[PDB]
Enzyme design. Structure first.
Site, PDB file in Angstrom:
ATOM      1  N   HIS A 167       9.080   9.540   0.875  1.00  0.00           N
ATOM      2  CA  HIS A 167       9.418   8.356   1.653  1.00  0.00           C
ATOM      3  C   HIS A 167      10.864   7.916   1.470  1.00  0.00           C
ATOM      4  O   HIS A 167      11.293   6.982   2.155  1.00  0.00           O
ATOM      5  CB  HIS A 167       8.468   7.202   1.306  1.00  0.00           C
ATOM      6  CG  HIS A 167       8.618   6.680  -0.091  1.00  0.00           C
ATOM      7  ND1 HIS A 167       9.722   5.967  -0.511  1.00  0.00           N
ATOM      8  CD2 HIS A 167       7.789   6.751  -1.161  1.00  0.00           C
ATOM      9  CE1 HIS A 167       9.572   5.633  -1.780  1.00  0.00           C
ATOM     10  NE2 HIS A 167       8.408   6.095  -2.199  1.00  0.00           N
ATOM     11  N   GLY A 220      12.255  -0.348  -6.947  1.00  0.00           N
ATOM     12  CA  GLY A 220      13.080   0.747  -7.413  1.00  0.00           C
ATOM     13  C   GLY A 220      12.380   1.734  -8.320  1.00  0.00           C
ATOM     14  O   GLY A 220      12.985   2.750  -8.689  1.00  0.00           O
ATOM     15  N   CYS A 274      10.007   3.735  -7.640  1.00  0.00           N
ATOM     16  CA  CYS A 274       9.499   4.906  -6.935  1.00  0.00           C
ATOM     17  C   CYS A 274      10.137   6.173  -7.488  1.00  0.00           C
ATOM     18  O   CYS A 274      11.362   6.332  -7.446  1.00  0.00           O
ATOM     19  CB  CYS A 274       9.774   4.774  -5.438  1.00  0.00           C
ATOM     20  SG  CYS A 274       9.211   3.217  -4.690  1.00  0.00           S
TER      21      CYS A 274
HETATM   22  C1  LIG Z   1      10.278   2.159  -3.759  1.00  0.00           C
HETATM   23  C2  LIG Z   1      11.018   2.377  -2.437  1.00  0.00           C
HETATM   24  O1  LIG Z   1      11.320   2.102  -4.679  1.00  0.00           O
HETATM   25  C3  LIG Z   1       9.606   0.741  -3.834  1.00  0.00           C
HETATM   26  O2  LIG Z   1       9.845   0.136  -4.814  1.00  0.00           O
HETATM   27  N1  LIG Z   1       8.590   0.256  -2.908  1.00  0.00           N
HETATM   28  C4  LIG Z   1       8.314   1.042  -1.717  1.00  0.00           C
HETATM   29  C5  LIG Z   1       9.012   0.669  -0.589  1.00  0.00           C
HETATM   30  C6  LIG Z   1       8.833   1.376   0.576  1.00  0.00           C
HETATM   31  C7  LIG Z   1       7.962   2.437   0.580  1.00  0.00           C
HETATM   32  C8  LIG Z   1       7.813   3.096   1.784  1.00  0.00           C
HETATM   33  C9  LIG Z   1       8.773   2.909   2.759  1.00  0.00           C
HETATM   34  C10 LIG Z   1       8.658   3.538   3.984  1.00  0.00           C
HETATM   35  C11 LIG Z   1       7.569   4.350   4.228  1.00  0.00           C
HETATM   36  C12 LIG Z   1       6.606   4.529   3.251  1.00  0.00           C
HETATM   37  C13 LIG Z   1       6.720   3.899   2.025  1.00  0.00           C
HETATM   38  N2  LIG Z   1       7.296   2.795  -0.505  1.00  0.00           N
HETATM   39  C14 LIG Z   1       7.465   2.132  -1.643  1.00  0.00           C
HETATM   40  C15 LIG Z   1       7.944  -1.046  -3.105  1.00  0.00           C
HETATM   41  C16 LIG Z   1       8.886  -2.180  -2.755  1.00  0.00           C
HETATM   42  C17 LIG Z   1       6.647  -1.135  -2.318  1.00  0.00           C
HETATM   43  O3  LIG Z   1       5.836  -0.284  -2.394  1.00  0.00           O
HETATM   44  N3  LIG Z   1       6.353  -2.283  -1.493  1.00  0.00           N
HETATM   45  C18 LIG Z   1       5.085  -2.264  -0.797  1.00  0.00           C
HETATM   46  C19 LIG Z   1       4.747  -3.658  -0.290  1.00  0.00           C
HETATM   47  C20 LIG Z   1       5.243  -1.300   0.363  1.00  0.00           C
HETATM   48  C21 LIG Z   1       4.202  -0.474   0.720  1.00  0.00           C
HETATM   49  C22 LIG Z   1       4.356   0.407   1.770  1.00  0.00           C
HETATM   50  C23 LIG Z   1       5.549   0.460   2.451  1.00  0.00           C
HETATM   51  F1  LIG Z   1       5.695   1.330   3.482  1.00  0.00           F
HETATM   52  C24 LIG Z   1       6.591  -0.368   2.096  1.00  0.00           C
HETATM   53  C25 LIG Z   1       6.440  -1.246   1.044  1.00  0.00           C
HETATM   54  C26 LIG Z   1       7.461  -1.171  -4.540  1.00  0.00           C
HETATM   55  C27 LIG Z   1       7.658  -2.350  -5.224  1.00  0.00           C
HETATM   56  C28 LIG Z   1       7.202  -2.410  -6.527  1.00  0.00           C
HETATM   57  C29 LIG Z   1       6.574  -1.312  -7.087  1.00  0.00           C
HETATM   58  N4  LIG Z   1       6.400  -0.202  -6.403  1.00  0.00           N
HETATM   59  C30 LIG Z   1       6.823  -0.111  -5.160  1.00  0.00           C
END
Ligand SMILES: *[C@](C)(O)C(=O)N(c1ccc(-c2ccccc2)nc1)[C@@](C)(C(=O)N[C@@H](C)c1ccc(F)cc1)c1cccnc1
Ligand SMILES: *[C@](C)(O)C(=O)N(c1ccc(-c2ccccc2)nc1)[C@@](C)(C(=O)N[C@@H](C)c1ccc(F)cc1)c1cccnc1
Lengths: 298, 299
Positions: A41, A142, A144
């Site tokens: 992602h 961050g 991830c």
């Molecule tokens: C990673 C990017 O560092 C991260 O912390 N999080 C994240 C953000 C976006 C995605 C994602 C983006 C586009 C497509 C698919 C996935 N994955 C992970 C956080 C901020 C996160 O997971 N937020 C949740 C609410 C989220 C779920 C799905 C999504 F698409 C976007 C956001 C995160 C925060 C704290 C701990 N882990 C992950």
């Protein structure tokens, strides 16, 4: 003497964490030999519309990748998509590569989360995979790409890479083979976990933990069959038991039968009065049999 | 996203832990820059009566010493007793001697324990020093000399070295200067442990962790002056609070002031009535303020 959720030494995992930066979005990567594993992602920045990964992979510009370990930049060469992982091939080979092997976690096992942000480790701690194939660690934006590992005999078993945080405060990671635990998706749609049922064989080693430490107040002469519990277990949020062969080693030193804790669990489950056990007012599945034996008899 | 007692990465400390053996007793030691530190009770093998360490230090045959880090055997050279510790000089230098320094900990701070057995690092977890100056962790036979450490910016600060295990299952160590914390004896004779009074700031930090994590069933609009709490803290097993200006950041993000927690502490210290806070049956001073800020907001 005592019982604490302790993590294994993170020293071998620590040199491999890199900082992978694709455009604006920057996250954590596991660097082994010439390859760098990170959640796929990173290639996405939508976070709003369903992502068509199959198309964005072929439409990738490697000029935007900038991978780093401190001040050194590793030069990106290629990248293929192994499941939810984006396996990236860099020119520099990690001189600090330990002896590694990938393995998948079966629910209830313990492993060590090396929380990392911007390719720099922050803290190491032990968690256990739950009945829903999700963990309950401590993660912030961050993380991830933070690796999870188990380590047996100077060899690292990368069993986890962080991918996404559910609204449950539960954390979902991918396998190093590219397989989301619990069948979840790295998609910007709302996803909900199932009911977390306590892993029974971890609660048992937790009860032998109390008898080795002398807390015998909860224990009585009652004994239940493996069968009558398995029947009672499903309806009361517990997992069924396959066999009781491994506890026989601890069961002899304690003198407390395996069928006897089962009668206690049926009682103690949602049953702890004012009196707590080893610092807990409710049964917990954090502690495995392996962990008990290492903290009680060397 | 969760509250999880975690330890900082122990990578820099792991090259230094060495197996120190003097005949029967075999235990762990820290190999810094060509000097191995270890508890002085490795020289003594007697656990019956009080031992004259001044007379045992002279009845010391360096030829008996066996230090090893894995297959490599170190050649022992010198040995001087410093306090309750043994500074041993050897020929090879830990070539990986990190940016190291020593410190003694004031009560209430959190540090990182690296439990070892047979010169082998085995686990790493966070712990905070109690008011009785005894940490409470996991240690099996043979963990004498497991270093504690705290790391501020890739520089390692060695703060603990395991010595003995008390009656209360409380664990006692020594600083790298050779001083037993809280003033204890590395002798077999029985020894009392003090009443654990809770560090107030770490309880306040633990409560903000609950307000940030949603559990707000225990919080109402009661403001308590710090002295009334200090007068109440001297008589109820807490500590008097110096300042709450560091809490200024958590109070604004939660909207709940520091006075509300201070009165709330007086409420729940009696008992939580079977309703747990963050999975805890009683108030806990385990989480320091800084460690709470790295987990909730991530600094
Ligand atoms: C990673 C990017 O560092 C991260 O912390 N999080 C994240 C953000 C976006 C995605 C994602 C983006 C586009 C497509 C698919 C996935 N994955 C992970 C956080 C901020 C996160 O997971 N937020 C949740 C609410 C989220 C779920 C799905 C999504 F698409 C976007 C956001 C995160 C925060 C704290 C701990 N882990 C992950
Ligand atoms: C060390 C040797 O690895 C160890 O585990 N323990 C220990 C044993 C003996 C001494 C000691 C020897 C000579 C003179 C003074 C002290 N120190 C530490 C254990 C077994 C231990 O501390 N046992 C208690 C009963 C003890 C306390 C004080 C004492 F002088 C002798 C024994 C130990 C067990 C578990 C955790 N830590 C240490």
């Amino acid at each position: 003497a005592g019982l604490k959720k302790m993590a294994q030494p993170s020293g071998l995992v620590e040199p491999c964490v890199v900082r992978v930066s694709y455009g604006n979005t920057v996250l954590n990567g596991v660097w082994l030999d010439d390859k760098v594993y990170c959640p796929r992602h990173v290639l996405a920045s939508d976070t709003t519309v369903t992502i068509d990964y199959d198309a964005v992979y072929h439409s990738m510009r490697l000029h935007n990748f900038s991978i780093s370990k401190g001040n050194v930049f590793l030069g990106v060469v290629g990248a293929v998509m192994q499941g939810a992982n984006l396996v990236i091939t860099v020119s520099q080979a990690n001189v600090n590569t330990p002896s590694y092997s990938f393995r998948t976690l079966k629910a209830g096992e313990c492993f060590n989360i090396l929380a990392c942000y911007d390719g720099t480790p922050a803290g190491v701690y032990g968690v256990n995979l739950r009945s829903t194939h999700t963990i309950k660690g401590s993660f912030v934006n961050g993380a991830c790409g933070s690796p999870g590992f188990v380590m047996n005999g100077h060899k690292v078993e990368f069993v986890y890479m962080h991918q996404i945080e559910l609204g449950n405060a539960s954390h979902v990671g991918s396998d190093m083979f590219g397989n989301i635990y619990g069948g979840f998706e790295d998609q910007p749609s709302i996803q909900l976990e199932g009911v977390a049922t306590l892993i029974t064989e971890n609660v048992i080693a937790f009860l032998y933990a109390a008898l080795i430490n002398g807390e015998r107040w909860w224990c009585s002469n009652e004994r239940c069959t493996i069968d009558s519990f398995n029947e009672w277990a499903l309806g009361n949020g517990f997992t069924n038991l396959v066999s009781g062969d491994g506890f026989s080693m601890l069961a002899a030193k304690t003198g407390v039968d395996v069928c006897q804790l089962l009668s206690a669990i049926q009682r103690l489950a949602t049953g702890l009065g004012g009196k707590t056990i080893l610092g807990y007012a409710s049964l917990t599945d954090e502690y495995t049999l392996s962990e008990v034996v290492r903290q009680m008899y060397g």
